[PDB]
Design an enzyme around this catalytic site. Structure first.
Site, PDB file in Angstrom:
ATOM      1  N   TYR A 149      12.539 -37.036 -16.773  1.00 21.02           N
ATOM      2  CA  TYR A 149      12.432 -35.840 -15.941  1.00 21.02           C
ATOM      3  C   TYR A 149      12.792 -36.189 -14.496  1.00 21.02           C
ATOM      4  O   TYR A 149      12.561 -37.317 -14.051  1.00 21.02           O
ATOM      5  CB  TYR A 149      11.018 -35.309 -15.959  1.00 21.02           C
ATOM      6  CG  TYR A 149      10.497 -34.784 -17.266  1.00 21.02           C
ATOM      7  CD1 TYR A 149      11.126 -33.718 -17.913  1.00 21.02           C
ATOM      8  CD2 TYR A 149       9.371 -35.335 -17.851  1.00 21.02           C
ATOM      9  CE1 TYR A 149      10.646 -33.236 -19.119  1.00 21.02           C
ATOM     10  CE2 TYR A 149       8.873 -34.851 -19.054  1.00 21.02           C
ATOM     11  CZ  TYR A 149       9.505 -33.799 -19.687  1.00 21.02           C
ATOM     12  OH  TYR A 149       9.052 -33.274 -20.892  1.00 21.02           O
ATOM     13  N   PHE A 187       9.098 -37.432 -22.527  1.00 22.80           N
ATOM     14  CA  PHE A 187       8.504 -36.112 -22.636  1.00 22.80           C
ATOM     15  C   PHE A 187       7.222 -35.912 -21.827  1.00 22.80           C
ATOM     16  O   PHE A 187       6.800 -34.765 -21.656  1.00 22.80           O
ATOM     17  CB  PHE A 187       8.268 -35.771 -24.123  1.00 22.80           C
ATOM     18  CG  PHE A 187       9.619 -35.607 -24.848  1.00 22.80           C
ATOM     19  CD1 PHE A 187      10.396 -34.487 -24.621  1.00 22.80           C
ATOM     20  CD2 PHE A 187      10.056 -36.577 -25.740  1.00 22.80           C
ATOM     21  CE1 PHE A 187      11.606 -34.350 -25.278  1.00 22.80           C
ATOM     22  CE2 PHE A 187      11.264 -36.425 -26.414  1.00 22.80           C
ATOM     23  CZ  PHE A 187      12.053 -35.314 -26.157  1.00 22.80           C
TER      24      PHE A 187
END
Length: 225
Positions: free
Chosen positions: A62, A73
């Site tokens: 991310y 995740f």
């Protein structure tokens, strides 16, 4: 064998070290790189080679503040759950008995149970998805996957999306257990991620072989006095 045992030679290769050079340079050139350097390898820190039971590949870390901390995740405590993880949670809620929506996106406790949460690229520039994808990280994580294939037995690999599927296309499907589905991102989750049932299927495979199942409800570190 530990990760460092089997990757020591890989981590002396220029594609690995030049990658780290590039990252360190960009961090000093006014670019924010995620995750922080101390977190880049947290998937390995939290899930030793001999403890890997389930491998879930991500692709890119991310790229926003507070999000990447070295696990595919996952996000740090207090940070919004990103859409991909929300869709994972929804599949979990629909399949694992007793599961309810967590109030956080922090997945260290999966890693601590044997879930290797491996992004295939391990750094990214803030706000710029895939910006480090053409360094040496895919080569590095190809080697990681190859070593799990060879050195471990009976690992469940959950390959979500075409990229992950290609990444794991040469895993031994007799000695290991390979499950494929579309990616949980909003762009693909309704194209077959929902319904894939991978979390239950993984646990049933593990059970069949005498391993304990994964408790997929993630939990935050606790307070002390």
């Amino acid at each position: 064998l530990t990760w460092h045992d089997v990757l020591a030679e890989e981590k002396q290769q220029p594609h690995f070290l030049n990658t780290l050079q590039t990252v360190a340079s960009e961090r000093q050139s006014g670019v924010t790189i995620y995750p922080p350097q101390k977190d880049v390898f947290n998937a390995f820190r939290f899930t030793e080679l001999g403890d890997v039971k389930v491998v879930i590949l991500g692709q890119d870390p991310y790229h926003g503040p507070g999000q990447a901390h070295g696990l595919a995740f996952s996000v740090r405590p207090g940070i919004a759950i990103p859409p991909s993880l929300l869709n994972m949670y929804k599949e979990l809620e629909n399949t694992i008995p007793g599961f309810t929506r967590p109030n956080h996106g922090y997945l260290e406790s999966w890693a601590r149970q044997g879930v290797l949460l491996l992004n295939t690229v391990l750094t990214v520039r803030a706000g710029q998805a895939h910006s480090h994808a053409s360094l040496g990280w895919e080569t590095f994580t190809d080697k990681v996957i190859s070593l799990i294939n060879q050195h471990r037995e009976g690992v469940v690999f959950l390959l979500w999306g075409s990229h992950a599927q290609k990444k794991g296309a040469i895993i031994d499907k007799q000695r290991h257990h390979v499950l494929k589905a579309p990616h949980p991102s909003p762009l693909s989750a309704h194209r077959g991620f929902f319904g894939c049932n991978h979390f239950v299927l993984a646990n049933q495979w593990l059970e069949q072989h005498g391993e304990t199942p994964i408790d997929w409800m993630p939990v935050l570190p606790a307070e002390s006095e």
